[PDB]
Symmetry: C2
Subunit: 130 residues, 2 copies
């Protein structure tokens, strides 16, 4: 889910500051994810690790921010500066949340058969959009 | 296309003010479109007609405003007030443009046969998203 719906605006800015600290400290190039565990009892955050790559769940962030993370990666490696139009990335002050998103992966894991993936011929596939 | 890319902000707001006048004067209920001709040589606008219904091109407007027109039609006819969360519609001050969109209708009209629509069984259909 993006953003995390149980966070206050304060917790949201707290986490963002920690992540910029980590990214700067490692002179990070490209897209990466800084992972925390939050103690639901206390509200405390604890850094766990950095995933130094794009992730399967990037899509929820693209939809609520409007920023294509893959084109951003390509422009960054072409030498573009974040905040210039040719980077595809706004300056921080122009990055905003717009709404909420969730994402799910649909698989052939059969819930009625202990999540063993099913296999074989798909006889019909019609997606739903809108 | 939404918004109209050849317009300035000032033009955009002039047009909005005319449209709100028409809507209010007709006590309009639901979704409607106020259509204008704009003279490309002078920048002058001219009211042509109101289309008193949703239109095929509503989709570009939805994507750049974030507002579901069809849900809004439904809440409005349920009696909701625009501006309340129940209406699915923000107050005017909270309605804003976010980026740019265009819509293309894919049809069986054959450019190789004077746009006569083709017909028959579709043997393969795979859309593209992202
Ligand atoms: Mg991890
Ligand atoms: Mg890991
Ligand atoms: Mg017309
Ligand atoms: Mg007409």
């Amino acid at each position: 889910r993006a953003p995390a719906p149980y966070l206050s605006e304060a917790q949201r800015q707290e986490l963002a500051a920690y992540s910029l600290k980590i990214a700067g400290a490692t002179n990070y190039i490209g897209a990466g994810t800084v992972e925390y565990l939050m103690d639901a009892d206390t509200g405390k955050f604890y850094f766990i690790e950095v995933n130094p790559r794009i992730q399967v769940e990037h899509t929820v962030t693209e939809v609520v921010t409007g920023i294509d993370i893959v084109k951003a990666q390509i422009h960054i490696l072409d030498g573009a500066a974040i905040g210039t139009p040719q980077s595809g990335v706004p300056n921080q002050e122009d990055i905003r949340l717009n709404g909420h998103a969730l994402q799910c992966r649909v698989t052939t894991e059969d819930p009625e058969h202990n999540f063993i993936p099913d296999y074989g011929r798909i006889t019909a596939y019609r997606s739903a959009s809108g």
